[PDB]
Amino acid sequence: VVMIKLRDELGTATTDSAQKILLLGSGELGKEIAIEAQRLGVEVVAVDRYANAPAMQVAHRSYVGNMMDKDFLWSVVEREKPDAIIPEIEAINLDALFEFEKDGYFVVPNARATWIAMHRERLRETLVKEAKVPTSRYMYATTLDELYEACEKIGYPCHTKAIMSYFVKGPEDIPKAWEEEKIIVEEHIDFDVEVTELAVRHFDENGEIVTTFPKPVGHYQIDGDYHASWQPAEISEKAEREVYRIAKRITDVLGGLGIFGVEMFVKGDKVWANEVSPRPHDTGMVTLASHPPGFSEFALHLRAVLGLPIPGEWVDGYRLFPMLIPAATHVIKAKVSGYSPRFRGLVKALSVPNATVRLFGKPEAYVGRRLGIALAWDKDVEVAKRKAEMVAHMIELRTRSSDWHD
């Protein structure tokens, strides 16, 4: 069960009455968690493998070290004795997380959830066997011959993914997929849209854990990287209810406190569970504009894990979290590498009404690195989507030793 209880009080950061969170992973999602913590006077310690990471800049103190090293993490935890340990990435020493928890430290949402989400087979079997939710048809392959059999049985086109990816359209792609050993082979779902349901487990006034559901977030990606997201996804009411049902079955199995990014595919009224991250997810950055102040996915996660309540509205057996206005995001990604990134095109980009940008503060860029986002809002979610894309495309980037790129 959950180690903490419903919270009625907060002290003040930098004094002996402070509450304290420890962010393991200091990227842009951790930065927004740190800003909400600062806005509540909660002390923030940010940890990552490099210095001046986004969340470290906003945090009260930081630690830099190899987050796969259990002894480094224990040293930080023993020094800081945080009220919540918030892992922001899967590349963290898993044994360490279980040991913190066994020793009484609150690991968010629990250590087991991160461990499960770490392994594709473990995760898929949990969804099928424990949560009992619908997923793409699939089979596993341990050898090249098994891969041929799987793709043929599943049917082309199919997706192959290492359990820890390739899109095989025909047998000619089998050799490539095998080179990308265990692999999961999945049937291709020709969905209308992919959605992330940001279900949050948190205490109600009785001290029991309730699950609250924001509107589904639609998104699209260039395989591996989300490129744009928006809220609400334009899906039917039946699909929406089914999205909540499936998310609830999954978060009931994972347990603990915190927000989850439950990923699903939607086609008409049909919904398939794809996977789930037991923490805030990048597509949810849209909630920085679509949810009211103090209620983005980062503030919801923070409130949940400190044991604070979160208001919601019960609708047909589901406790929903009302959206403020439709919104959308579009990533600003580096096409070059190097130190001291710079961004231009702001006169045009920042003159667009109902939109703005957030630049993450990363000190170095690498090709494909997300450096910021454009955010836009409108009564019409499609107008917000086009607008965020437009603003992001007006921005060009350069580093110390590179030329400008669009």
Ligand X SMILES: Nc1ncnc2c1ncn2[C@@H]1O[C@H](COP(=O)(O)OP(=O)(O)O)[C@@H](O)[C@H]1O
Residue 103, both tokens: 């020793």
- Within 8 A by CB and 6+ apart from 239, the residues are 266, 268, 269, 270, 271
The tokens for 10 are: 């907060």
Q: Is 275 annotated as a binding residue?
A: yes
The DSSP output letter for 37 is H
**Cis peptide upstream of residue 157 (ω within 30 degrees of 0):** yes
User: Measured between alpha carbons, how far is 353 from 341 in angstroms, rounded to an integer?
Assistant: 26
Site track for ligand X across 154-183, x = CB under 6 A: -----x-x---x------------------
Structure tokens at 83: 């009220």
CA-to-CA distance for 99 and 121, rounded, in angstroms? 24
Binding a second copy (rule: CB under 8 A), the pick from 3, 4, 11, 102 is: 11
Q: Do the beta carbons of residue 156 and residue 173 sit within 8 Å?
A: no
Q: In the set 122, 342, 368, 401, which binds a second copy (CB under 8 A)? A: 342
CB 169 within 8 A of CB 228: no
Are the CB atoms for 387 and 375 separated by under 8 Å? no
Q: Which residue type sits at 391?
A: V
Nearer to a second copy, 236 or 340 (CB): 340
Q: What, of ligand X, a second copy, none, does residue 221 touch, CB below 5 to 8 Å by kind?
A: ligand X
**Other Cβ atoms closer than 10 A to 397:** 24
> Binding mask 204-233 vs ligand X (x if CB under 6 A, - otherwise)?
-----------------x-xx---------
Query: How many of the chain's residues bind ligand X (CB under 6 A)?
Result: 14
When asked if residue 90 is in the footprint of ligand X (CB under 6 A), the reply is no
**What length does the chain have?**
406
Phi, psi of 178 (to 5 degrees): -65, -30
Nearest to 197 by CA among 257, 239, 164: 239
Say if residue 124 carries a ligand binding annotation.
Answer: no
- Letters for 120-139 (x = contact with ligand X by CB under 6 A, - = none) are ----------------x---
The reply, when asked if residue 263 is annotated as ligand binding, is yes
- Rank residues 60 and 112 by Cβ distance to a second copy and give the closer one: 60
Q: Which does 159 bind (CB under 5 to 8 A by kind): a second copy, ligand X, none?
A: ligand X
Return d(Cα 55, Cα 46) in angstroms, integer: 6
Q: Which of 88, 186, 242, 389 binds ligand X (CB under 6 A)?
A: 186
Q: Tell me how far CA of residue 344 lies from CA of 49, 227, 359, 373, in angstroms.
A: 29, 20, 12, 14
| Residues 40-79 contacting a second copy, CB under 8 A | 40-41, 52, 57-58, 60
Contact with a second copy (CB under 8 A) among 375, 384, 388, 392: 375
State which of residues 188, 245, 270, 369 lies at the interface with ligand X (CB under 6 A): 188
Query: Residue 114, interface with ligand X (CB under 6 A)?
Result: no
User: What residues are designated binding site for Mg(2+)?
Assistant: 263, 275
Q: Which residues form the interface with a second copy (CB under 8 A)?
A: 6-18, 31, 35, 38-41, 52, 57-58, 60, 205, 288-289, 292-295, 299, 303, 308-313, 322, 324-325, 339-348, 350-363, 372, 375, 377, 400
Q: Which residues form the interface with ligand X (CB under 6 A)?
A: 136, 159, 161, 165, 186, 188-189, 194, 221, 223-224, 263, 274-275
User: What residues are designated binding site for ATP?
Assistant: 120, 161, 186-189, 194
